[PDB]
Design a protein around this ligand. Sequence first.
Ligand code: HEM
Length: 214
Amino acid sequence: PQDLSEALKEATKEVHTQAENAEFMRNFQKGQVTRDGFKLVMASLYHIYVALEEEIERNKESPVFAPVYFPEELHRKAALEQDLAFWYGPRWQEVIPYTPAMQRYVKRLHEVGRTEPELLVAHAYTRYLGDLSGGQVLKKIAQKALDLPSSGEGLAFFTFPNIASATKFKQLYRSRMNSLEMTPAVRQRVIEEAKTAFLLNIQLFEELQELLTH
Ligand code: HEM
């Protein structure tokens, strides 16, 4: 399609399904998530978003990323810090896992931000528009599965408080994505990088399910 936002959506349909089909996500969707499994995905997300948000800050004034720079609206590191303090306690930094599959994803995010920053939009699309677009169904599942106390914390990640309307915001973000100027080669690489981002998530899911089933 002409618009990058539509090109991305169409090009990643089949890997999104692969993610939906991954065993860990099948189980999450059938509501068979455990607190230990949930904790692991929240730890994963912290590492991913620390790396992604570091590289967005690095490249925020670059013409290859500035049009989609929305820090107040989208930043997730602080929310995940709040959440991990709940799930892993006050010493969470010293005890959260940082696994090889998590490292693989973080490594690629830094390579992209430092040496192929034109591709960073692919990673911000995959994470932010996915977490925003899917956050509604994704949260629903946990709360009814995790039996959390009524302690007012642990799921801040699933609320973007500086977005009053997700629908308006997605429209805006897509608009901005579409205003990026790129050659056909870069556009091709951006699309492939969005597929790569999905596969990095899928391989993570495969690792976490392994870790949880000993
Ligand atoms: C069990 C797994 C998953 C479920 C149930 C699912 C849920 C959703 C929902 C409900 C939407 C709405 C579609 C729309 O935009 O109209 C969607 C969008 C999307 N999700 Fe997921 N998702 C899952 C896995 C993931 C993963 C692992 C990623 C990436 C890390 C992801 C990235 C995306 C993206 C980028 C979109 C937005 C598409 C676009 O508008 O271009 N999803 N997903």
